[PDB]
């Protein structure tokens, strides 16, 4: 139910 | 610890909604507010299988609400730190999230209330009301990093308050706050500077705070729909940003213009966001705005 | 003997204003600093220094007892006026 | 970036040894510090320094949150290095 | 104020004696001490004419023995702040303070037991107990400044300990105290650079360590009977200090002269003084004392 | 009954 594809694993590019 | 409450004062009635570590309850508080016998709250808390990453960001979102007393900020009400598992208590948002709410509205929604979508009145509204939010915010020096709409929650009478500080982050000391290793971000919501950099002020706020009424006048539609996340980080970064949706009023327009400003010393403050909608507002939001307190100094 | 009587402290100096004073010289005046009292927290005072050229306000618990913290600043800003 | 990590920070050397490191060099080391693991109250530090021949103990709130005090310290160190 | 007590816990019974400013009264204090359900205790009190700087003192006292938990320091029970009078909370010390029972012991006393004055032995014993009390006291980074027979109290199984912490001072940050401005003070038992540059120290603490011992071993005589203060001021500062007293142990005799040494640095450390006499004491000493400890690292 | 003697209101010598 709650939204984790709003997520991104990511760092400053 | 003036915040803790004894874990029989508290009774868990149903499940609200599932977190992404944790499990959201509906419940009762016996005398967590003076005055009041028993009180209808919202319970949070943490998966026996969550990180100690994940608990840690649980005990922050605790923590920063109690030096929080705002009309259009979700309240804290109350600590259960003594044996876990470890329960929040804060008020109950009668009406949930406000994207889950906006898609309500969709015409076709299968959980159409019995009304049609916002009205511009109504749209302006809600924008005064999560602006006002955050400037209190702003004021306190925190910065939010996750403002979306479904953040936003929506009381019994449909006022809109600002919701979530897991990724809140107190910026006293700087005016931003600046990630360098990785981490899970609200990328669709970012502004250029904070995928860029990874710096986030009460500016990338601002844009989050665009991409927020782009969902209210699109009833939550995916943003940047069809892109990937990484398409997303290369098109804001170089220049790019959302259309218009559908009707969009084009006053609401000219807010996300100002809120997607490349330059973040572009951007409008919360403050003057509400400056320019203090007029065409309900008559009750001078006696509860952060905008029109004492405390706005 | 007291706050008062210190170059280094400067009353009710803004925020603002401090971080343009610390900062007025870039990273050249990297260390520079003044204390000042809180425009938020009142009764409390705040360490508003240069940091490579970065203005950075630092929350303190200050203002009886507080001789030796005063004796510290006081050496700081003495290795400062040494610039 | 840690505590641990920096050459101000000297962990759980005793206030006895810490004063004696700071007065080596009489008045004329005036101004040298070091930051400890307190010996009486656990989990603060204490700031152990110098002035003019004297050896003065502050007791600290520190070891998250705690990065721009680090870089505080830092920037005094780094005054001092250079003398 | 996690020292707070209900005052309705508390229960005066009679009168134990008259403070300079105040009045200390025995008493019942009902859940004070876990696992007890009412206990007897002295209470502390101040006069409603008692002046400002002498309501400092007392709130003095009261604050720096919340840090305190030593068998040789009479301990602090709790305090009653809410609403005048205030109310110091303390373990009763059945025997009252050791001068008046020293004064006891002597042969003339219209109040005499029924014992003859005190044992080398014994005297030892009451030695190493107070030492060990500011010893204690030393390793917490305070100075007591006011150690004298008066402020030295007697348990009912006549255990002496240390008490009246109304002019101590935290010496953390600097190792030492310095008054600049006049004030009272225990001039008799005061060390030489004290009455002349005001500063306090362990040192000075030792100095009226020795005075203590004279006391015992003269039976509470009044020290430097005969001088007026001013005299004793002069006499003290250039050198001077008191006479053996009459069949004065030569032990004992010996510690005065080491308390006695114009340099404060020629003087023992209270951690000196137990060691010096830690075999020939009572065997519960190493159960209790501060010496004996784990915490005496 | 209190010691009130053995005070003296004073300020260092020197
Ligand atoms: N980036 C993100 O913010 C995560 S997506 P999300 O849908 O906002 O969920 P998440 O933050 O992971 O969920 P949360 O733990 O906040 O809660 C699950 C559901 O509980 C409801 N909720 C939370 N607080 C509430 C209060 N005070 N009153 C009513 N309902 C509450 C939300 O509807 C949420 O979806
Ligand atoms: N320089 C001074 O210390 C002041 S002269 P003093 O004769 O020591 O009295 P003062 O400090 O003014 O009196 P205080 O209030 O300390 O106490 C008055 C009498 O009460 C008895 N007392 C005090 N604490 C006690 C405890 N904990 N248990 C039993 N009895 C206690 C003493 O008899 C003291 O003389
Ligand atoms: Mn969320
Ligand atoms: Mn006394």
């Keep these: ?13 | 610890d003036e915040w803790e409450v004894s874990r029989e004062k508290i009774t868990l009635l149903r499940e609200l909604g599932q977190g992404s570590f944790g499990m959201v309850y509906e419940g009762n508080a016996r005398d967590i507010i003076k005055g009041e016998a028993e009180t209808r709250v919202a319970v949070k808390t943490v998966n026996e299988s969550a990180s100690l990453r994940e608990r840690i960001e649980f005990l922050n979102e605790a923590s920063v609400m109690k030096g929080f007393t705002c009309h259009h900020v979700v309240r804290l009400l109350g600590v259960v730190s003594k044996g876990q598992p470890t329960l929040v208590v804060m008020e109950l948002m009668a009406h949930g999230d406000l994207k889950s709410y906006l898609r309500s509205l969709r015409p076709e929604a299968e959980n159409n209330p019995g009304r049609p979508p916002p009205t511009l009145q109504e749209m302006i509204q809600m924008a005064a009301e999560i602006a006002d939010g955050m400037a209190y915010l702003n004021a306190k020096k925190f910065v939010h990093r996750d403002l979306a709409a479904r953040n936003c929650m929506v009381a019994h009478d449909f006022t809109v308050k600002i919701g979530d500080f897991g990724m809140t982050r107190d910026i006293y000391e700087t005016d931003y706050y600046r990630k360098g290793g990785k981490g899970l971000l609200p990328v669709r919501w970012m502004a250029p500077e904070s995928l860029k950099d990874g710096v986030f002020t009460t500016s990338s706020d601002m844009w989050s705070f665009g991409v927020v009424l782009w969902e209210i006048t699109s009833l939550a539609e995916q943003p940047y729909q069809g892109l990937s996340n990484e398409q997303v980080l290369k098109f804001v970064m170089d220049g790019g940003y959302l259309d218009q949706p559908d009707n969009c009023p084009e006053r609401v327009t000219d807010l996300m213009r100002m809120c997607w400003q490349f330059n973040p010393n572009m951007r409008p403050t919360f403050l003057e966001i509400v400056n320019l909608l203090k007029d065409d507002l309900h008559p009750s939001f001078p006696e509860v705005s952060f905008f029109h307190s004492e405390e706005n100094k | 003997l007291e706050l008062s009587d210190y170059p280094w402290f400067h009353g009710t100096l803004s925020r603002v204003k401090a971080a343009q004073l610390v900062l007025a010289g870039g990273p050249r005046s990297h260390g520079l600093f003044v204390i000042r009292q809180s425009e938020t927290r009142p009764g409390e005072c705040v360490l508003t220094f240069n940091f490579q050229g970065k203005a950075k306000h630092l929350r303190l618990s200050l203002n009886g007892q507080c001789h030796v913290q005063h004796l510290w600043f006081q050496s700081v800003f003495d290795m400062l006026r040494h610039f």
Excluded: E, K
């Design chain 1, 1 to 13: 139910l709650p939204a984790t594809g709003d997520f991104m694993n990511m760092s400053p590019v």
